[PDB]
Amino acid sequence: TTYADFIASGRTGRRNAIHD
Amino acid sequence: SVKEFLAKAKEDFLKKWENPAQNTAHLDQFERIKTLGTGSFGRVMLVKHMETGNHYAMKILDKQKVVKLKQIEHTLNEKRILQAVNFPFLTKLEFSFKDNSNLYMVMEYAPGGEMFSHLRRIGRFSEPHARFYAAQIVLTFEYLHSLDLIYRDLKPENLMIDQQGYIKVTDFGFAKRVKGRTWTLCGTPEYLAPEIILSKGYNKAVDWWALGVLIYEMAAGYPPFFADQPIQIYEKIVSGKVRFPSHFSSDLKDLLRNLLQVDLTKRFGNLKNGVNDIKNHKWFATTDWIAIYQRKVEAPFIPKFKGPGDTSNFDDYEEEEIRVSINEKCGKEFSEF
Numbered sequence: 406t407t408y409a410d411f412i413a414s415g416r417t418g419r420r421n422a423i424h425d
Numbered sequence: 426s427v428k429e430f431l432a433k434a435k436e437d438f439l440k441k442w443e444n445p446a447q448n449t450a451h452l453d454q455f456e457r458i459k460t461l462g463t464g465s466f467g468r469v470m471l472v473k474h475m476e477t478g479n480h481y482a483m484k485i486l487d488k489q490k491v492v493k494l495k496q497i498e499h500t501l502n503e504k505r506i507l508q509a510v511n512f513p514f515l516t517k518l519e520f521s522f523k524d525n526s527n528l529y530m531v532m533e534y535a536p537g538g539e540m541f542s543h544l545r546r547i548g549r550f551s552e553p554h555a556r557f558y559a560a561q562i563v564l565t566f567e568y569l570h571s572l573d574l575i576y577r578d579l580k581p582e583n584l585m586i587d588q589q590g591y592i593k594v595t596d597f598g599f600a601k602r603v604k605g606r607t608w609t610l611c612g613t614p615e616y617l618a619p620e621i622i623l624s625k626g627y628n629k630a631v632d633w634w635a636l637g638v639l640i641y642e643m644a645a646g647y648p649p650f651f652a653d654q655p656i657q658i659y660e661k662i663v664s665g666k667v668r669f670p671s672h673f674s675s676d677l678k679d680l681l682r683n684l685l686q687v688d689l690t691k692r693f694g695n696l697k698n699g700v701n702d703i704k705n706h707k708w709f710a711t712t713d714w715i716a717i718y719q720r721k722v723e724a725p726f727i728p729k730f731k732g733p734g735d736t737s738n739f740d741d742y743e744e745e746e747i748r749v750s751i752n753e754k755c756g757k758e759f760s761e762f
């Protein structure tokens with residue numbers, strides 16, 4: 406499931422801004 | 426009238442934009458209580474203003490770290506904007522000041538914590554739950570955009586919940602007053618419009634794309650474009666393909682196809698009818714926009730609240746001193762702060 410893939414991914418925690 | 430309300434709001438804004446408040450408190454006036462969160466060059470702490478006993482959130486930026494990250498101009502934008510705006514879903518800047526080491530911005534405390542925390546824990550929000558938050562963002566962008574402000578940092582992590590369950594937008598580090606196109610690559614991978622990723626000049630339409638991402642994430646429990654690395658997220662964003670959960674209503678899906686629209690000539694928010702394309706969309710048919718602005722709508726989720734400076738809705742962060750060098754750092758760079 407898409408939820409299962411999300412939960413197993415490395416980006417379920419707080420996501421940092423990008424700055425370039 | 427909305428247009429008339431906005432006309433007057435702009436007069437209020439411009440007076441403060443042109444003559445910003447400066448040096449309106451001092452660190453020694455506050456008792457530091459708990460770190461509420463962190464960023465690359467700063468932190469936010471719950472503090473108590475001693476003379477009133479009011480609680481506030483105090484954003485503390487290390488000037489040296491601001492410089493190393495090339496965020497001087499962006500930080501001056503944040504403070505100048507925050508001190509000038511006034512809207513129910515924005516945190517007022519109550520005070521600001523600086524010392525040898527740091528920049529300080531004191532704003533209202535939102536005890537409900539980050540939307541992010543509740544979203545992840547609960548898994549996803551019902552459509553009415555998401556719609557209630559969504560409407561507050563629509564109104565806030567309508568306000569900011571009317572002031573020629575672009576926001577650029579929309580995400581659940583940066584949407585604070587107040588004691589009544591309403592939203593506060595607090596972080597203006599990427600907010601900019603710009604009438605034309607702008608070009609800075611900034612924001613959060615999951616929330617980037619294609620225009621940004623593709624290194625085009627872009628405008629406030631990127632905020633309306635970010636709204637689509639947020640509504641999707643709120644209702645699905647995960648964002649529309651995700652992967653383990655940012656490069657893979659960017660390829661998904663630019664490819665021009667979104668899949669919706671089967672539980673998404675037909676109206677929700679149609680709203681999202683028009684917000685998460687790569688074609689700027691068709692993206693809602695961006696067209697002739699502007700924000701009314703969004704407000705008058707069928708998914709929002711039950712929304713009483715006036716009642717949302719007046720905070721007369723019952724929040725579908727209202728936060729657990731035990732005392733004035735209670736922090737149970739926030740995560741725990743390592744506490745780190747607030748060090749103030751005996752030498753002034755970066756004086757020229759931050760002179761106007």
Ligand SMILES: [NH3+]C[C@@](O)(c1ccc(Cl)cc1)c1ccc(-c2cn[nH]c2)cc1
Nearest residue numbers: 462463464467468469482533534535582
């Ligand atoms: N949600 C974002 C961050 O965690 C935060 C922390 C550090 C920096 Cl530099 C930027 C943003 C935050 C936490 C709490 C508050 C807050 C709480 N009440 N009022 C504002 C605002 C931002």
